Copies of this chain bind each other. A is one copy, B any other.
Amino acid sequence: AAIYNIDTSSESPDHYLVDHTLDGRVLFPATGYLSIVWKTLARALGLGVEQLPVVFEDVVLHQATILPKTGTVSLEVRLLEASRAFEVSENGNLVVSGKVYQWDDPDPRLFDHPESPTPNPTEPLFLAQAEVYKELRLRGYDYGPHFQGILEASLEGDSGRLLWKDNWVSFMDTMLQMSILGSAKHGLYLPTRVTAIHIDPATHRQKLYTLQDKAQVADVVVSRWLRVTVAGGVHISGLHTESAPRRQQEQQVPILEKFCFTPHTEEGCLSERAALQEELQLCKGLVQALPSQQELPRLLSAACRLQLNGNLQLELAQVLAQERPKLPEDPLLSGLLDSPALKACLDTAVENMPSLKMKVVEVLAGHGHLYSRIPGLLSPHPLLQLSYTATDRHPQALEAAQAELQQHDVAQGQWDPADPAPSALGSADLLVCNCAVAALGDPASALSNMVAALREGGFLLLHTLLRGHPLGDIVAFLTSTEPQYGQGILSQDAWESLFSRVSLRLVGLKKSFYGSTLFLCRRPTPQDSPIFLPVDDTSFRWVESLKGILADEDSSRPVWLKAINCATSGVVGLVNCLRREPGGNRLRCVLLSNLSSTSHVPEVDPGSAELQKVLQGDLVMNVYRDGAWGAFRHFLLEEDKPEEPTAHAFVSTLTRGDLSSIRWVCSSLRHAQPTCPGAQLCTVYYASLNFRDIMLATGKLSPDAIPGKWTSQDSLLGMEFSGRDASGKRVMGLVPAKGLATSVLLSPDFLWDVPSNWTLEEAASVPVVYSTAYYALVVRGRVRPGETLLIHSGSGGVGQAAIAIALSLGCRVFTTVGSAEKRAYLQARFPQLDSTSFANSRDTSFEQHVLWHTGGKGVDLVLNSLAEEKLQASVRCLATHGRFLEIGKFDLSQNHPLGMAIFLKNVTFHGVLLDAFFNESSADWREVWALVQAGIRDGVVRPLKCTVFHGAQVEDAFRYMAQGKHIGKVVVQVLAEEPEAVLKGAKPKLMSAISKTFCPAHKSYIIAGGLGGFGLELAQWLIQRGVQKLVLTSRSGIRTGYQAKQVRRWRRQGVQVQVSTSNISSLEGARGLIAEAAQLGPVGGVFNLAVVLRDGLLENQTPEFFQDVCKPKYSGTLNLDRVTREACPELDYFVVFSSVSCGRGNAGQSNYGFANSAMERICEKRRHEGLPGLAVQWGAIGDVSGTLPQRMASCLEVLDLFLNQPHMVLSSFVLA
């Protein structure tokens, strides 16, 4: 009863277990159980572990134990010496069981490395430790340093070389890692059963040898033909790994956003919306001549109902349901605040300030309520630190809602705009008022106090209702009792005049269609002589001038970077990085980037008043585009997943195991390139739901369990279907997977013809059930007429098919059903059955029924699908020469035992699996096909009872099937059946489904710098879309074991992968690269991932560094952009990978940000002409600035959305 406590604390000797993290959670190594069992045995025999050669057998792990972050878990070990059995328990729960015993006579010959199947190519390349553990991480294993024991491994992973740190657990776990490395099955697989393990410490010591370094190693060899792993004095055979659930919780949540131009001044922003239009229509109507839930219409209804005209001021001002401060809740009053315009203004303020910290104070927060809306908008900024505070007219105001202020870091204040601000607030960084609902004490006094309270160069943001607009007049008529609120409404020209009187400058103005406006003004700053340094010059020789200018740390003159000769200049990304470096405060950018030649190009000469206006503004960003001055701003991306109308969709669960996530997604059949002899596309009208589909949808069955090569991402729901052939013929088919969709592609050998009398609905239930019944009985069981049969679950589809087949032969059938109604249904459907033919299937009582009613002889043929105890009971029902047809999976998957004594009865035991036909042995499938055809034409085959669900209600169908009350089969009417027999117009009706990315097999795709880190992942992701034509570019070619491994794997699958080594920086190189792709086929898309980086503060930077950094990205994007428009009418994607460094800025990477921004400009230009174009801004890629690295799975998942998303530039990152 040995007891082991596993403590992972730093002091505990088992601290190394912390490094065995799989799927993000620490797990006790499968070999740890072997280690503790070995130690327990050695203690039992009184020997030492090093002196005890041991043998394990039939090791089976019944669950996984999770080592907690804190605390300890006790593992108990019990040994049965007589039976040589052992049992490990956790809180009295079985964990590991098997057999362990001493090895009497160790045989050194056992550990000699077996014959190598390969011809010993002696290839030079091999995976180093870093590459091995990078691949393992990509697969999902996160071993730490203590479990990083593989020094190297061959490309195919058959042989390697492991470290020996005098730890058995690590060594054996490393052996398991080597075994898993060679497998092609993507996913997280863990050991479940091991046939036998032999450990011999003496030969282990003999085998170990020391490299030139003192580290000890031990060669490892993995033989998949023999299913054995040998390394030093250890020998593992018959390992069996099973797919882990792989579901990780609290996954990363990237902040998806778009990056679009935004004019400084804009009016009529909300004109797009309609609810606001209807609200305004209602409001104006109720005022004519002097009925909804919205507060303002309610107030107008109060003003009218109480009295049609001449309403008392008291009643209109004071009345229930209106005196409540619900005015901001009215959609019209909050139209601008909900719009992105507020975010644009806030970002404009945040950009123009030296300190990374913000000090913003709200006034009259009792009514403005901006405190509940401003801080949330600023969460996306990674490093921004905010010091917000809400101030009201009197402390009694905003007395409630304190918890809202508590959740945020908002402080309290008691400043009245009438008087000057208290010293505590001081020179605030930003002032937010919300004059729309809050009542100003007075315009002049409020502005005079606020401007004083605002630091020099600070920003003042105001929201109100401009006088003279219909809404302004409407509000003026009401609230006549609140003269302060009346003072808060003035004409836009009145505001203009008021700003000048207070020596304040307007920089931004967002106006709604109904008069609501969002002013943005900043306190002027002492004018100083600026510097105008042009940057449009190529060769970056201007960098020296800029570096010199910033050298004068004493000098404080503002520095203006001027770019007025290249719409593709990346100065916007340049300044962002510089502002995070010393002397970056003085930086200020002016850019002219008209996307249309016809657009006017203004002059920015110092004399030109146009330049003077922006100089007065003094904004960091001054981007001019088509007669407008604005800048690029980040906005959150719409959450809805884009959908499109299509005729090729399939049903899939977006989130594994969640029936609520079932939805229609676009199918890869949209291209249907492989339409040829040996396959054909068939329209789908009805699709059936089998038990396996429910198991997949519920998540209880892994996709890998389905035989066949399946993409890591793909939908495998549905096996049957009935619908019209490509020629209009009515047919019913059978597919390994993807049956539940609007179309299916299958070989003609799996199609039957629906008889005239049948209907497409009926035929949808025949194929799988009758095919499996015919196979299991006739082909395998070889039933003969007159024999006795036991058919468990007669009410099921397979049960009904088997019953129908058996009766036709004239056989006595015993069947088991779960409830009385099913028994009655069967009795009605099969009159031959009598009362002595039904037994209960939820209980083992059927065993006595069969034995009694057969005189104790038993049955000849058993078609079992039940559980372990039911199965064992069923075996006892077999007669001499019996035959056990088994179609279940639980016992077989679990490898439960079976007493071989039953075979003394001369019985036969069959493992029936229809899935084998799809993979191979299609020659023998035609036998079952002919059987089913004969049964159809001879009347033996009858369609089952079908419950129909429409396509939209597929989730309801899954729910109903899961409940388990159905009798017969459940089908999904994808498309109704036309009365006509043969219809030429077999085109599926257009449907709206989620949009995915798929690539034709007859197009070529280029990935500049594809051999890099992220490049290989992108290439593999594309291959999962069936690219079948790929060109990867790299200056140095293939020079790493990982790259060669991946490339050879792709070539093996049949993809034509080409490595060009043709630079895109030179125009001729780009043209040659494009021409090379055309040889394989027309160019589908080009991806630019080339990058060469040289960091350093601008002082260290030199023109050579800028040229190097911009050579692959800026110049290459220009070239590839020129060569694609000229030579690629077919191409549909022009993707480019920018970085968060630009847009968000990053210290010491000015050249990198410049290159990325200039690159984004090209993509913006291309879209304007309708050509494909997309620049993606990534924060940090994990597996290969205040933001965490982003896992590759999440990166590719996001990339899939962006391809679908319309915006020209998009970004994604993970907050700290």
Q: Tell me the A residues contacting B by CB distance below 8 Å.
A: 78, 80-83, 85, 87, 89, 92-95, 97, 114-115, 117, 193, 195, 224-227, 238, 780, 848, 851-852, 855-856, 876, 880-881, 886, 889, 891-913, 916, 921
**B911→A115 contact, CB < 8 A:** no
**B898→A897 contact, CB < 8 A:** yes
Contacts of A80 on B, CB cut-off 8 Å? 78, 80, 87
**A911→B921 contact, CB < 8 A:** no
Contacts of A892 on B, CB cut-off 8 Å? 900-901, 903-904
Residue in B82, B852, B895, B909 whose CB lies within 8 Å of A225:
B852
Contacts of A856 on B, CB cut-off 8 Å? 224-227
**B912→A906 contact, CB < 8 A:** yes
- Chain B nearest CB from A3 CB (Å) reads 14
**A903→B899 contact, CB < 8 A:** no
Known: A94-B82, A908-B780, A908-B908. Contact between A851 and B900, CB under 8 A?
A: no
**B848→A226 contact, CB < 8 A:** yes
Contacts of A908 on B, CB cut-off 8 Å? 780, 908-911
**A906→B900 contact, CB < 8 A:** no
**B903→A886 contact, CB < 8 A:** yes
User: Can you name 8 A-B residue pairings with CB atoms under 8 Å?
Assistant: A83-B87, A225-B855, A881-B921, A892-B900, A897-B899, A902-B911, A906-B912, A908-B910
Closest 5 CB pairs of A and B: A903-B911, A225-B856, A895-B901, A897-B897, A82-B94
**A899→B895 contact, CB < 8 A:** yes
Contacts of A82 on B, CB cut-off 8 Å? 87, 89, 92-95
Contacts of A886 on B, CB cut-off 8 Å? 900, 903
Contacts of A81 on B, CB cut-off 8 Å? 89, 92
Contacts of A907 on B, CB cut-off 8 Å? 911
CB-nearest residue of chain B relative to A238? B876
Contacts of A89 on B, CB cut-off 8 Å? 81-82
Contacts of A889 on B, CB cut-off 8 Å? 904
**B897→A904 contact, CB < 8 A:** no
Which residue, of A82, A906, A908, has the highest number of chain B Cβ atoms within 10 A? A82
Contacts of A78 on B, CB cut-off 8 Å? 80
Residue in B227, B897, B916 whose CB lies within 8 Å of A900:
B897
**B893→A904 contact, CB < 8 A:** yes
CB-nearest residue of chain B relative to A924? B881
Contacts of A902 on B, CB cut-off 8 Å? 911
**B916→A880 contact, CB < 8 A:** yes
Contacts of A95 on B, CB cut-off 8 Å? 82
**A225→B851 contact, CB < 8 A:** yes
CB-nearest residue of chain B relative to A84? B94
Residue in B83, B97, B852 whose CB lies within 8 Å of A226:
B852
**A909→B906 contact, CB < 8 A:** no
Known: A92-B81, A901-B892. Contact between A851 and B226, CB under 8 A?
A: yes
- Chain B nearest CB from A906 CB (Å) reads 5
CB-nearest residue of chain B relative to A890? B900
Contacts of A93 on B, CB cut-off 8 Å? 82
Contacts of A238 on B, CB cut-off 8 Å? 876
Contacts of A94 on B, CB cut-off 8 Å? 82-83
Contacts of A85 on B, CB cut-off 8 Å? 87
Known: A81-B92, A117-B852, A903-B910. 17 other contacts (CB 8 A): A78-B80, A82-B87, A82-B95, A114-B852, A193-B901, A225-B855, A227-B851, A227-B856, A896-B899, A896-B900, A897-B897, A898-B900, A904-B913, A905-B911, A906-B916, A908-B910, A909-B909
- Chain B nearest CB from A107 CB (Å) reads 11
Known: A81-B89, A81-B92, A880-B916. Contact between A900 and B910, CB under 8 A?
A: no
Residue in B117, B876, B900 whose CB lies within 8 Å of A895:
B900
**B909→A913 contact, CB < 8 A:** no
Residue in B227, B848, B903, B911 whose CB lies within 8 Å of A906:
B911
Contacts of A225 on B, CB cut-off 8 Å? 851-852, 855-856
Contacts of A904 on B, CB cut-off 8 Å? 889, 892-893, 911, 913
- Chain B nearest CB from A702 CB (Å) reads 14
- Chain B nearest CB from A105 CB (Å) reads 13
Contacts of A913 on B, CB cut-off 8 Å? 904, 906
CB-nearest residue of chain B relative to A81? B92
CB-nearest residue of chain B relative to A896? B900
Residue in B114, B780, B905 whose CB lies within 8 Å of A848:
B114
CB-nearest residue of chain B relative to A901? B895
CB-nearest residue of chain B relative to A891? B900
Contacts of A899 on B, CB cut-off 8 Å? 895-898
- Chain B nearest CB from A240 CB (Å) reads 8
CB-nearest residue of chain B relative to A86? B80
Contacts of A115 on B, CB cut-off 8 Å? 852
Contacts of A876 on B, CB cut-off 8 Å? 195, 238
Contacts of A227 on B, CB cut-off 8 Å? 851, 856
Contacts of A906 on B, CB cut-off 8 Å? 911-913, 916
Contacts of A83 on B, CB cut-off 8 Å? 87, 94, 97
Residue in B880, B901, B912 whose CB lies within 8 Å of A893:
B901
CB-nearest residue of chain B relative to A883? B908
Contacts of A193 on B, CB cut-off 8 Å? 901
Contacts of A226 on B, CB cut-off 8 Å? 848, 851-852, 856
Contacts of A855 on B, CB cut-off 8 Å? 117, 225
Which residue, of A78, A195, A855, A906, has the highest number of chain B Cβ atoms within 10 A? A906
- Chain B nearest CB from A84 CB (Å) reads 9
